[PDB]
């Protein structure tokens, strides 16, 4: 059933979770279906594309002389998992920031979900004049618009398909990387860049086998 029309189709579905036989009826139903799984693949990817860039950027810039070493700290010692460590000097405590985090994100998430449940619904109701930017599109993952694609890149359809899968190939790689950051940190107890600096120095001596 994998025709290959999709961007990131390379014929790898051993378990058969994307088949159209499952969820035969019509309705909302369950999460496992082509409409939701395709949507969650890029969401995981984009969030991970941001995370893997940010988990290693302060450490790299810290080894370099640009950023102060006080701020340059391992991604797991910056406030998440306070047993690991906690940055004392922010402009507010973590829990105050979490209520900021939750609120400002709840808006963005719920609104996106509402868009998935009923397309174009968020433009119809007044939202502080920002309704023109949320018109959406046929597909729930690639809305586009005056903001999300403010610089219209793929005016041609063929150029979009090339970008639509470069978003995935560069993205599915990042998801693996963050899975490496978590596993590296537990065993090594050090940042991801310092672990790289060791394998380049003593590869045979610094390794998972060790």
């Amino acid at each position: 059933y994998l025709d290959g029309t999709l961007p990131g189709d390379y014929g790898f579905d051993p378990l058969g979770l994307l088949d159209p036989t499952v969820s035969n009826g019509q309705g909302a139903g369950g999460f496992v279906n082509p409409r939701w799984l395709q949507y969650s693949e890029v969401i995981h990817a984009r969030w991970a594309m941001l995370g893997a860039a940010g988990c290693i950027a302060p450490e790299i810039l810290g080894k370099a002389g640009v950023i102060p070493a006080e701020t340059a700290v391992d991604w797991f010692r910056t406030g998440v998992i306070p047993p690991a460590g906690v940055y004392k000097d922010f402009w507010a405590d973590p829990f105050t920031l979490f209520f900021i985090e939750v609120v400002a994100i709840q808006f963005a998430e719920l609104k996106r979900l509402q868009d998935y449940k009923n397309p174009g619904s968020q433009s119809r109701q007044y939202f502080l004049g920002l309704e023109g930017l949320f018109k959406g599109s046929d597909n729930p993952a690639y809305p586009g618009g005056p903001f999300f694609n403010f610089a219209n890149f793929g005016k041609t359809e063929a150029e979009m398909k090339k970008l639509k899968l470069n978003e995935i190939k560069n993205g599915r790689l990042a998801m693996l990387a963050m899975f490496g950051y978590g596993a590296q940190a537990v065993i090594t107890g050090d940042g991801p860049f310092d672990n790289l600096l060791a394998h380049l120095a003593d590869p045979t001596g610094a390794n998972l086998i060790t």
Binding site: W91, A92, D93, F95, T96, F99, L110, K111, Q114, D115, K117, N118, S121, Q122, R124, Q125, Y126, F127
Partner: protein, 208 residues
């Protein structure tokens, strides 16, 4: 055709939009029947109007206490004012329960039967004391002619409800950030304005 509490949600069938402060908010399917809907709009307004009347009493005293006047906290105010009063407790309660049973009962029978109290039995009053709508009387409770115009009466109903929902949320606030800080509401305000980043609900020692 109008705003809603969650954009994109289909509003219920029974909430047409004529009522004041209608945003299609009833997931429990309450007020689905006409008779219960006729009862709840009157329950919402009294819970509102008592909130406005009460919360203003708390701000007036808590501000007068912060300025220097002799006013106590809204909490533990009935305990310190009864210690030194000529009116015992029990004579003050059943002066309130007995006097409200008159009003609260007359309001009930206007609900069950509109226009019933305007018969002229009570001291020969007929044109007043008959309801204009369910929870919106007039004549005597509207001395100023601020309701003899449907254009300016329909939006005033929207302001009575919007400043009311907000008001009875505030009373829940006073309960909550009293139990945490055991201070007045105004004192909690000046602290947040003094050091907004540091003094929040996270740093009160409670709720964590």
């Amino acid at each position: 055709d109008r705003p809603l509490w969650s954009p994109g949600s289909e509003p219920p069938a029974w909430l047409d939009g004529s009522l004041a402060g209608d945003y299609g908010f009833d997931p429990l399917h309450l007020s689905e029947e006409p008779e219960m809907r006729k009862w709840m709009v009157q329950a919402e307004l009294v819970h509102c109007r008592w909130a406005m009347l009460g919360v203003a009493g708390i701000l007036f005293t808590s501000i007068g206490a912060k300025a220097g006047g002799n006013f106590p906290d809204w909490y533990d105010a009935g305990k310190e004012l009864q210690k030194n009063s000529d009116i015992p407790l029990g004579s003050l309660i059943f002066t309130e329960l007995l006097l409200f049973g008159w009003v609260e009962t007359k309001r009930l029978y206007d609900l069950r039967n509109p226009g019933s109290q305007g018969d002229g039995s009570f001291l020969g009053i007929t044109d007043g004391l008959k309801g204009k709508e369910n929870g919106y009387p007039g004549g005597l409770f509207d001395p100023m002619g601020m309701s003899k115009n449907e254009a300016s009466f329909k939006e005033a109903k929207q302001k009575e409800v919007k400043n009311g929902r907000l008001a009875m949320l505030a009373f829940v606030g006073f309960i909550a950030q009293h139990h945490a800080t055991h201070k007045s509401p105004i004192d909690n305000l000046l602290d947040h304005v003094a050091d907004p980043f540091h003094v929040t609900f996270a740093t009160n020692g409670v709720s964590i």
